[PDB]
UniProtKB/Swiss-Prot annotation:
Key words, A-Z: Cell membrane, Glycoprotein, Membrane, Neurotransmitter transport, Phosphoprotein, Symport, Transmembrane, Transmembrane helix, Transport
Name the record gives this protein: Sodium- and chloride-dependent GABA transporter 3
Topological region Extracellular: 92-155
Organism: Homo sapiens (Human)
Catalytic activity: 4-aminobutanoate(out) + chloride(out) + 2 Na(+)(out) = 4-aminobutanoate(in) + chloride(in) + 2 Na(+)(in); taurine(out) + chloride(out) + 2 Na(+)(out) = taurine(in) + chloride(in) + 2 Na(+)(in); beta-alanine(out) + chloride(out) + 2 Na(+)(out) = beta-alanine(in) + chloride(in) + 2 Na(+)(in); hypotaurine(out) + chloride(out) + 2 Na(+)(out) = hypotaurine(in) + chloride(in) + 2 Na(+)(in)
GO molecular function: amino acid binding; gamma-aminobutyric acid:sodium:chloride symporter activity; monocarboxylic acid transmembrane transporter activity; taurine:sodium symporter activity
Stretches assigned to coiled coil: none
Family per record: Belongs to the sodium:neurotransmitter symporter (SNF) (TC 2.A.22) family. SLC6A11 subfamily.
Bilayer topology: Multi-pass membrane protein
Record's keyword annotation contains Transport: yes
Tissues of expression: Widespread distribution in the brain.
Residues of the full protein shown: 61 to 592 of 632
Amino acid sequence: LSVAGEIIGLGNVWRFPYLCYKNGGGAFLIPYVVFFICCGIPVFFLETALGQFTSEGGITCWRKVCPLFEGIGYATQVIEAHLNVYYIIILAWAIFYLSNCFTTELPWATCGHEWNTENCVEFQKLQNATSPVMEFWEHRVLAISDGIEHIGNLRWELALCLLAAWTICYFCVVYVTATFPYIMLLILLIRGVTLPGASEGIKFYLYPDLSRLSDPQVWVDAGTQIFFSYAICLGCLTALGSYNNCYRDCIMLCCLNSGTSFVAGFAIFSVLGFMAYEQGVPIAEVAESGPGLAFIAYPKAVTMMPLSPLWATLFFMMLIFLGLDSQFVCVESLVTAVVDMYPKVYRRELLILALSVISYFLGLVMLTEGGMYIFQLFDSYAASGMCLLFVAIFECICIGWVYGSNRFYDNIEDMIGYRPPSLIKWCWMIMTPGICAGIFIFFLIKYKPLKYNNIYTYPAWGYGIGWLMALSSMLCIPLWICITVWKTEGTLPEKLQKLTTPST
Ligand SMILES: [Cl-]
């Protein structure tokens, strides 16, 4: 077919504009492109080829080729387990936004309600002036607190919204369903461009500021954005696919995702220009630098359109569909992955329920009055950050050096009929492991505290929690190496020979 439908998700329309604005905009595109061509394509091709060659799931696929490096198989599951916990919180806010839109006038368009303070200004017909949209996002949807040290009470309204999300996916495609996001994204893009003052937002988006490139954060959260959007170190090995066009896929599939992210991001910054023009405030400080950005720019565009409620209900439906089509795959893969002993057969209907309840109660802690602060730690340390950089290094080293790139190339040529260009092999051997290690060391040397919204500075134990969350997935590989060395064959090159020959 021509429409794969596997070229979009919440990682494209929610995360990418969030990261670009936070890092300063414009200067974020240069590290993005470097990772895109030299660490985004070769690794994706390696995952797909390795998955299809063995026709076998990731946990045992590494046993087939890299018996010493089983820690890669276990590391991806821990990252996926962390991801399922906080990837559904976004659908908690989307449902809450949707429920408020089933009325004539949108509550966030106009000020003068209980949550709005005395500083509300319509700006549609100026010191310490706030837009009504930001007040709606912060005071009632989040009810932000002073800091992480105040967890506070639990938001009851958000609690049941999360319950609904889970319930719906406990039972979790037509062409119209697949092309629904693209039509809506185009409609939103048209409205933003024609808006007055959008030229500043585009100039802010494209023209880079080379002074900020020296900051280690920009490099860390660009390549990690590439890895997160592609689902590279979260389970990507596909047994299905028969004997194919694996190389031809990335020239079409694993590159067009970046185009969608770029186009979708283009729409948001057009709206941010209009708000800056209206309020007469620099684009740098016109909005919130945290995760809650797609909930401040998109509602403004939807309330600047005729028939506002009709457009309002649909876009949140698009977000709900995007989240549902992406989390059920992960929750199915993780449950299937733990089934490798098969003690007995309602096992298929018991683990699926057991996993959901644990995730619901552990996803409930970030729905309280101090939930945004803990959500920020989850987004920066678990399922991202150093966890993806570390695993990507060990993946390319084993196949590139231990197993042998030339042997793998021969198998790929056998499978598809021709040998891919030699550039990919050099990537695997030197480029990706070197760049990832360099970024790791650069970030470690110039360690600066992470700040929420560039205002709040976390306490010591917050950074400690983040570091433990990263280590919980970063420490599976050396531990397995030590265990395998100590047990089975202990010493001498005999164990070294056994721990390198692939399974026959
Ligand atoms: Cl992306």
